[PDB]
Amino acid sequence: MEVMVFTPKGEIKRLPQGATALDFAYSLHSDLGDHCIGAKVNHKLVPLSYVLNSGDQVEVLSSKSLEHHHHHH
Numbered sequence: 448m449e450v451m452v453f454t455p456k457g458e459i460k461r462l463p464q465g466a467t468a469l470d471f472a473y474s475l476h477s478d479l480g481d482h483c484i485g486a487k488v489n490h491k492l493v494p495l496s497y498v499l500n501s502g503d504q505v506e507v508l509s510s511k512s513l514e515h516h517h518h519h520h
Contacts, residue, residue, distance in 0.1 A: 450501040460505075468495045472507045483507045 449461050452471065460474050468488070472480030485508035486495055499505055 450499055452499055452501070452503065452505045454504075455506055462499055466499050468493065468497050468499065468505070468507065471499060471505050475507065479509055479511075480507065482509045482511070484510055 448464055450464065450466060452460055452462060454460055454475065460471065462470055462474065468486035469480075469483075472483045472486075474480075483495075486493055486497060487506045487508055488497060488499065489503045
């Protein structure tokens with residue numbers, strides 16, 4: 448049984464059973480998802496290993512920082 452969740456834009460994103468906040472971040476994008484510093488579900492705080500629930504809204508937290516070349520290549 449898959450779980451249906453909604454993003455801030457109201458887009459439909461279905462995730463497989465046993466899915467986690469990390470999986471949802473990857474569903475949206477790669478660079479933005481890798482910049483996930485936290486997760487927020489149902490306007491309530493929850494850990495990254497938190498299991499996603501159907502009907503509940505999922506929103507990944509990101510610093511959307513514009514900094515670049517911060518780390519040494």
